[PDB]
From a paper:
Among the most commonly used non-immunoglobulin binders are monobodies (Mb), which are generated from large combinatorial libraries using a fibronectin III domain (FN3; ~10 kDa) of human fibronectin as molecular scaffold. Here, we develop monobodies with nanomolar binding affinities against the d-[name] domain of the leukemic tyrosine kinase [name]::[name]. Two crystal structures of heterochiral monobody-[name] complexes reveal targeting of the pY binding pocket by an unconventional binding mode. In summary, monobody recognition is dominated by the FG loop of both monobodies that form a rippled β-sheet with the βD-strand of the [name] domain, as well as ionic interactions between glutamate residues of the monobody and arginine residues of the [name] domain.
We determined the crystal structures of the l-DAM21-d-[name] [name] and l-[name]-d-[name] [name] complexes at 2.7 Å and 2.9 Å resolution, respectively. Of note, to satisfy the large amounts of protein complex needed for crystallization, this batch of the d-[name] [name] domain was not desulfurized to alanine after NCL and therefore contained a cysteine residue at position 198. In both structures, we found the d-[name] domain to be dimerized via a disulfide bridge of Cys198. The monobody FG loop, which represents the most extensively diversified region in the library, forms a large part of both interfaces, which have similar buried surface areas (431 Å2 and 440 Å2 in DAM21, 452 Å2 and 427 Å2 in [name], for interface 1 and 2, respectively). Interface 2 of both structures largely contains the pY peptide-binding interface (346 Å2 for the pYEEI peptide), whereas interface 1 comprises a region of the [name] domain surface of unknown functional significance. Unlike those, DAM21/27 form a heterochiral anti-parallel β-sheet between strand Gly84 to Trp88/His88 in DAM21/27 of their FG loop with the βD-strand (Val190 to Arg194) of the d-[name] [name] domain. The rippled β-sheet position Glu85 in the FG loop is inserted into the [name] pY pocket, where it forms an ionic interaction with [name] residue Arg171, which is part of the conserved FLVRES motif and makes the most critical interaction with the phosphate group in pY peptide ligands. An additional ionic interaction was observed in the DAM21/27-[name] interface: [name] residue Arg189 interacts with Glu51 in the ßD strand of the monobody and is located at the other end of the heterochiral [name]-monobody interface. Structural superposition of the FG loop conformations of [name] and DAM21 revealed a strikingly similar conformation despite their sequence differences in seven out of eleven amino acid positions. In [name], Tyr79 packs towards the β-hairpin and His88 is solvent exposed, whereas in DAM21, Trp88 is rotated inwards and would clash with large hydrophobic or aromatic residues at this position.
Residue numbers in the entry: 6 to 98
The structure:
């Protein structure tokens, strides 16, 4: 019951990940892409992607680390920012 519906890593590189997802069938202002070492270690970092795009590329990662990417789809409906149920994946760089 999530938005985006599917989140995958398409391209990988020793220091970077390329991620694609599925255009929700409903209106979306922007996405926030969130990524950090799975296991709390080293604070999470994030960056923002226009609602029209369904592709991002994550940079400056450490090789051979378990990262946990999470994507929030924000709306801006009658006056308010609110995100749908987010989606996460784990990926070993």
């Amino acid at each position: 019951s999530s938005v985006p519906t599917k989140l995958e890593v398409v391209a990988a590189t020793p220091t970077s990940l390329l991620i694609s997802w599925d255009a929700p069938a409903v209106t979306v202002d922007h996405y926030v892409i969130t990524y950090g070492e799975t296991g709390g270690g080293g604070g999470s970092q994030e960056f923002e992607v226009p609602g029209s795009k369904s592709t991002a590329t994550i940079s400056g990662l450490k090789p051979g680390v378990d990262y946990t990417i999470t994507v929030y789809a924000y709306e801006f409906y009658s006056g308010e920012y609110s995100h749908f149920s987010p989606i996460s994946i784990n990926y070993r760089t």
